[PDB]
């Protein structure tokens, strides 16, 4: 399938334990892939002081259109020092690895895989 149906837990910045995928773009992007797939991803809402608080590279999740059964369609894109690889809507939140924190809510997302 092009697009698959996720539930994702909303996490804390402060209770993150592993504050990113990994140390390049392409590795970033991957490593949040294989967590999107293997239902090991969290996601952390953007605001201010979030950001300086997890590693770059950041993946975030932006919304691709305007929600099939409840779940907003989206796709990735990686930050590193100020440059986007990728091009599309509004955060929806920044991507991380999910290690058992306890979620505050769930984000329904249709992701193109």
Same mark, same amino acid.
């Given at each position: 399938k092009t697009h698959v149906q996720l539930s994702l837990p909303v996490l804390q910045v %402060? !209770?993150?334990? =592993? %504050?990113g995928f990994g140390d390049s773009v392409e590795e970033v992007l991957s490593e949040a892939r294989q $967590?999107?797939? !293997? *239902?090991?991803? /969290? @996601? &952390? #809402?953007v605001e201010k002081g979030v950001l300086?608080?997890?590693?770059?590279?950041?993946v975030f999740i932006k919304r691709? !259109?305007?929600?099939? $059964? *409840? $779940? =907003?369609? &989206? #796709? @990735?894109?990686? #930050?590193l020092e100020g440059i986007q690889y990728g %091009?599309? /809507?509004?955060? @929806? /939140? =920044?991507?991380v690895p999910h290690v058992g924190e306890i979620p =505050?809510?769930?984000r329904k997302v249709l992701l193109r895989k």
């Open positions: %402060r !209770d993150v334990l =592993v %504050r $967590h999107l797939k !293997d *239902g090991t991803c /969290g @996601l &952390v #809402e300086p608080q997890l590693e770059q590279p950041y691709s !259109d305007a929600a099939p $059964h *409840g $779940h =907003v369609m &989206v #796709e @990735l894109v990686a #930050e %091009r599309s /809507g509004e955060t @929806l /939140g =920044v991507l =505050v809510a769930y």
